[PDB]
Amino acid sequence: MYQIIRYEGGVYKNNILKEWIEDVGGFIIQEHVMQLDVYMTIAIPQNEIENFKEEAKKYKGKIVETPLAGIEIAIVSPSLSRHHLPHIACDVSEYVRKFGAKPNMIGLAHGAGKNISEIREKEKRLIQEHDIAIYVMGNFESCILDKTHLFKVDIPLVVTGGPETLDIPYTYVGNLGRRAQRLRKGEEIRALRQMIDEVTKKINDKRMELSYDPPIIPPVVLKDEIEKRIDEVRGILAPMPIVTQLDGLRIKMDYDRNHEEIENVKIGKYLLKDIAYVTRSEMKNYILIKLKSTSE
């Protein structure tokens, strides 16, 4: 119903456009003003897409179709050191961001090495809390092959590495190894696009799975209702105060202090505790909301 896109335009007369979006029933998921241009991730009903395109072309704006602007991705790097973090890992994260997703760098405590690499249970659960996980591996076939125990999560997976083709029982994208320069060559860009296509395919499949038994309320409108009701969400200092997942939300407020308030939020005629699973998150003691399906 609500297809999510990105509007890129100027700040002049942007308030009138926001008023129009409110009038037609859309939601402004994201807003950022750089100097004189504003980027807005907006979720509006499908029957108003052409109307919004006409409105955007009136303000000399630009509509960018974001195929991943409803999910949060766990980019898993073996460590946050100079080998992986300041290059490749950021390129993967920023390319994911370029298509609307909300990434989270996951630097494993013991992810480096060949036979000394291990993944903890807490890291496993933290990765599982996301929608899809992207692994940024090295550039040796033997090292990657002797490292399959790292990619043991019941989440859609895309593994990236140096060698062009791997023989692991997962999706693999080659020519994205451990590097030290910014990814700007044509081959590297093509490999990034291939990784984007793989994650897009997995996300669309999962979207069909969810569409078989739709949730009682969409995550985006649930986030809007929480923002309207809860008055502490504008005091959050995190990058994304409320993250829109595929079938839920992540509220970046303390669980011990605000879970009772979150649960006792009335949407429609239901109480939130009766339609969603509110639980504490392994992510800095935040609140994780998982929506129930109409079957229950």
């Binding site: 308030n15 008023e19 409110e22 037609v24 029933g25 009903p45 029957n47 109307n51 409108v221 309207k228």
Partner: protein
């Protein structure tokens, strides 16, 4: 009918008259609302689609 979309039709006869009242409940099918803030304060809307509540 001054403005039409796929979700509402609006009237702009009194678009510069202020009101200070909040009634933020669901804009259901065939709901009549008056925008109370912004550039279009005072416009009267009739909604053809079931939409969420709005503070404006």
């Amino acid at each position: 009918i001054s403005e039409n979309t796929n979700t509402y039709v609006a009237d702009c006869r009194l678009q510069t008259l202020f009101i200070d009242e909040e009634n933020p409940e669901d804009r259901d099918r065939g709901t009549i609302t008056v925008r109370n803030i912004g550039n279009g304060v005072g416009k009267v809307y009739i909604y053809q689609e079931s939409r969420a509540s709005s503070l404006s």
